[PDB]
From a paper:
Pannexins are a family of ubiquitously expressed large-pore forming channels which regulate nucleotide release during apoptosis, blood pressure, and neuropathic pain. Among the pannexin family, pannexin 1 (Panx1) has garnered the most attention for its role as a large-pore forming channel responsible for ATP release from a variety of cell types. Different kinds of stimuli have been reported to activate Panx1 including voltage, membrane stretch, increased intracellular calcium levels, and positive membrane potentials. Like other large-pore forming channels, each Panx1 protomer harbors four transmembrane helices (TM1-4), two extracellular loops (ECL1 and 2), two intracellular loops (ICL1 and 2), and an amino (N)-terminal loop.
We further stabilized frPanx1 by truncating the C-terminus by 71 amino acids and by removing 24 amino acids from the intracellular loop between transmembrane helices 2 and 3. Purified frPanx1-ΔLC was reconstituted into nanodiscs composed of MSP2N2 (an engineered derivative of apolipoprotein) and soybean polar lipids, and subjected to cryo-electron microscopy (cryo-EM) and single-particle analysis. We used a total of 90,185 selected particles for 3D reconstruction at 3.0 Å resolution. The map quality was sufficient for de novo model building for the majority of frPanx1-ΔLC with the exception of disordered segments of the N-terminus (residues 1–10), ECL1 (88–100), and ICL1 (157–194). The frPanx1-ΔLC structure revealed a heptameric assembly, which is unique among the known eukaryotic channels. The Panx1 permeation pathway spans a length of 104 Å, with constrictions formed by the N-terminal loop, Ile58, and Trp74. The narrowest constriction is surrounded by Trp74 located on ECL1. We observed that the distance between the guanidino group of Arg75 and the benzene ring of Trp74 from an adjacent subunit is ~4 Å, suggesting that these two residues likely participate in an inter-subunit cation-π interaction key to Panx1 ion selectivity. Mapping such residues in the Panx1 structure revealed that they are clustered proximal to the extracellular constriction by Trp74, in a groove formed between ECL1 and ECL2. Based on the lack of channel activity at 0 mV, our current structure may represent a closed conformation.
Author numbering:
A (entry chain B), B (entry chain A): 11 to 87, 101 to 155, 169 to 170, 195 to 357
Write the structure that this text describes.
Amino acid sequence: VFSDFLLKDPPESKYKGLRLELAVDKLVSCIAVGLPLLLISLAFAQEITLGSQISCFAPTSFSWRQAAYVDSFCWAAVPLWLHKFFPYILLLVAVLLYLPNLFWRFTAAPHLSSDLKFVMEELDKCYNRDIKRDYPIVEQYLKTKNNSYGLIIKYLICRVVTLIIVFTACIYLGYYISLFSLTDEFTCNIRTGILRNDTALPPLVQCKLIAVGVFRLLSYINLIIYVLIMPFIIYAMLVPFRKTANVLKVYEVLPTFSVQQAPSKTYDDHSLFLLFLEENVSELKSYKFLKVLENIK
Amino acid sequence: VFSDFLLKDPPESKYKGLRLELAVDKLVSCIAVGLPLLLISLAFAQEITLGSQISCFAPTSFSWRQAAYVDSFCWAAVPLWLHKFFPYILLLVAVLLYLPNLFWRFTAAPHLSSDLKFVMEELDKCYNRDIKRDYPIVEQYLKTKNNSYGLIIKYLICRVVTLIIVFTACIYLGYYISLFSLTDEFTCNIRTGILRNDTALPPLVQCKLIAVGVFRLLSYINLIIYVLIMPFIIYAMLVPFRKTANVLKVYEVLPTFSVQQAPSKTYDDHSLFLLFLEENVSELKSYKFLKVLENIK
């Protein structure tokens, strides 16, 4: 009985290439973080070529600096801040979106990695020794992960943070779009604190926001992409209803492994671990041999 | 008896991946250092596009440079320095926050690393040889760390430095917010030292601070994030009341290891070492075998 409990070695950097994120979470994260960076890079580029935020039509009686004053004054205060702070909300949401994958990498990745390596090495050993009564090591190990919750708790944490951030960004951009595309100019007053009773200046002045066009374009692009990537976040968040293949069911054609009685797919570590195992089954060497073998029969 | 005291080798770069910081301290440090850098990067970017700090409405009778003089003069002196020095306090607190993890890395990390490697190699040897009377090497070694204090002293040093810096930054930003969001302009005088009795200049002039909006936004963001990450610092600082799993209790199902009588969780090196051991138990190979083994029984 107890002979295949002795730990010998990993006889290589054998795995070195396990994937610890299910490729859809990976694509979604890359896109959602990258898009605002490209947008605001272009934004800052064009704004540093324009070299101004607004332009006011000052009266000729002013000098240079006397007009620069009103042009700087009217850049301060219907909300104008949804325009003043646009290139900052995007960086903010980009960084907030980068955070959850850091959370994953530092709190769940190494545990999951060790578990995957253990299960895979055990399966390879079992097949290799029984192709030529022991205890169901892998069966009992996977039975242990049937009332724990840490892995799935952390997973759902990451997914819900991502969904919340994307939803908020969407409604912000939407209000921007539905508010600014009706005009781009406004009336500004200057004589307020000391010049209040100074008749040497106009009672009003006009100024125009000179980036509304580009910002509206970027808003449309970002909103479309985000509403496109929301459903994938939800489909990922629905773990116990995804599509699997039961690699543990392909392994049951050898003399003494198991016969998996019946699953239930509840929210627990068993389901998430099975998902990661199926994603990484590309590296299990014995898998293809057993597949063709059960095909011959 | 004395046979398992001979040092043979680490038969690989076996561990090469121990984690020397408990993932919550890691996340907190990354966030707290990174956030002000992103904020002040954006600040310096926008301020170099604006190319000015204030704007004063000089009388038309001035020339160009004669108005530049008042515009530069009134940028000097209710505190205006809380506005003048804003992009510097943030870099200061970022660097002060980076310091404690350097302190940890240089005074505690290598000792802890050697200790972890020793304990883990010893446990693996013990299991591997007794799965097929000796002295409790690991039990006595962990007994030695029961009246020393260096590790926990350094740990608490780092945590309290972090908490102090975060608290001070919070109250600074709070005073900024509660002071500047009532106005953005002030009255300035010029004729003071030589032009005092020079009637060729106005008795007053107005100037406006042209970054109050952006700085207030950054202040809100930073204050919210810092008050969010304070509780985690405290929860970390409360070492002897955290949640563990007693991996040394899972190891006691083999013939001659121990039976852990009773803990007390006082402030000492034993508790902190147990925390680090539980964090790094992902690499102990025998751990999962023993877990499934005690499950079968």
